[PDB]
Amino acid sequence: ASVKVAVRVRPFNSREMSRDSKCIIQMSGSTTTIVNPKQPKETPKSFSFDYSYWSHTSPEDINYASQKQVYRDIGEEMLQHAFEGYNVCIFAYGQTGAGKSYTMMGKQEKDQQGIIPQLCEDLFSRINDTTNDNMSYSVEVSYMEIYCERVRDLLNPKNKGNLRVREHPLLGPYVEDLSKLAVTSYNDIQDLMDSGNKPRTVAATNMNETSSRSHAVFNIIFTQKRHDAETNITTEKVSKISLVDLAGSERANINKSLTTLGKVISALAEMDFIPYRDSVLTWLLRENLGGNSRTAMVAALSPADINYDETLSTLRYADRAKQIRNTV
Numbered sequence: 001a002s003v004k005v006a007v008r009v010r011p012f013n014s015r016e017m018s019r020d021s022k023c024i025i026q027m028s029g030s031t032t033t034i035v036n037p038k039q040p041k042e043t044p045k046s047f048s049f050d051y052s053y054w055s056h057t058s059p060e061d062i063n064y065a066s067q068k069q070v071y072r073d074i075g076e077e078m079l080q081h082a083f084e085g086y087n088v089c090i091f092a093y094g095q096t097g098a099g100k101s102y103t104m105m106g107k108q109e110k111d112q113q114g115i116i117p118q119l120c121e122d123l124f125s126r127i128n129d130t131t132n133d134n135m136s137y138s139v140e141v142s143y144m145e146i147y148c149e150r151v152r153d154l155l156n157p158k159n160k161g162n163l164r165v166r167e168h169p170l171l172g173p174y175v176e177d178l179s180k181l182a183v184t185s186y187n188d189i190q191d192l193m194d195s196g197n198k199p200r201t202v203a204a205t206n207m208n209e210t211s212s213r214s215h216a217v218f219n220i221i222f223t224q225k226r227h228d229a230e231t232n233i234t235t236e237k238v239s240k241i242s243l244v245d246l247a248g249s250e251r252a253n254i255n256k257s258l259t260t261l262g263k264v265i266s267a268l269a270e271m272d273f274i275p276y277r278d279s280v281l282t283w284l285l286r287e288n289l290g291g292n293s294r295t296a297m298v299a300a301l302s303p304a305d306i307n308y309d310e311t312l313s314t315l316r317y318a319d320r321a322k323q324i325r326n327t328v
């Protein structure tokens with residue numbers, strides 16, 4: 001199953017408006033076109049993706065791509081696979097301030113909530129709508145940050161241990177002693193999500209906002225138990241959902257995981273060895289990038305002329321990822 005890829009351009013932001021930036025991005029169907037502001041004499045480069053989301057204007061536009069479309073397209077599709085019994089993964093990629101957090105977390109208001117909130121909500125809604133008493137559920141969550149190769153429990157900032165990433169001799173990679181909490185309602189999960197968001201590492205270089213060098217991985221362990229009065233054995237289906245918000249693509253080493261992710265994606269796109277263990281990110285996400293899992297990428301794009309190089313680079317790496325195929 002191919003890694004599905006979407007790209008999304010946001011409206012100008014303060015930095016761009018202050019330099020009178022023009023828009024160098026265009027979309028139509030599933031195709032995204034980028035113009036080169038420095039060399040207007042060349043022909044615009046175009047890429048095609050599963051989805052090319054135009055969110056450059058405002059929800060008052062008939063053509064604005066809303067947090068709801070985005071989720072109903074890729075988010076919903078993955079949740080359904082999770083229910084099928086498939087592990088899934090969605091990660092946001094892009095230059096700092098491109099729109100990664102907004103797309104993944106968004107803002108809890110004006111129906112401005114991103115993929116994570118909507119998926120969690122959608123998930124409990126479905127669970128509570130079950131009418132077959134032979135089915136019972138379990139939902140566990142974990143939330144971590146990876147900053148400079150260091151892993152931190154975001155749901156338990158009451159422990160400074162930089163959790164160690166271990167390779168289980170038989171079951172794969174796992175963060176040692178990372179808290180896994182049972183949640184029985186959307187409100188509860190959303191509270192953990194909220195506290196977790198504040199625990200994230202900040203940086204003075206970012207005006208003390210969340211460091212553009214931290215990766216956040218939100219995981220859900222969805223267990224389905226199906227019982228039937230007969231032989232009396234309850235069968236179990238366990239799906240792991242990984243929702244990832246990555247550090248800026250160009251915003252014990254600072255950029256190891258991101259550079260390594262790039263190599264792993266290129267390698268995988270070419271292949272169809274891979275340096276998974278070269279970084280904690282690619283190591284933990286090994287099975288989501290080539291392994292047994294349905295996966296998707298959402299690449300955030302700045303629409304500004306001043307970010308051409310970084311945006312072209314994001315489009316290129318997104319184009320690559322489109323060629324990856326996992327073995328599920």
Ligand SMILES: Nc1ncnc2c1ncn2[C@@H]1O[C@H](COP(=O)(O)OP(=O)(O)O)[C@@H](O)[C@H]1O
Pocket residue numbers: 009010011013055094095096097098099100101102103212248300
């Ligand atoms: N689709 C969108 N609709 C509206 N505003 C957006 C959209 N994408 C990005 N933005 C705006 O851009 C800013 C930066 O996106 P953000 O998610 O914070 O950055 P990053 O990619 O570094 O995580 C936000 O403060 C938000 O107001």
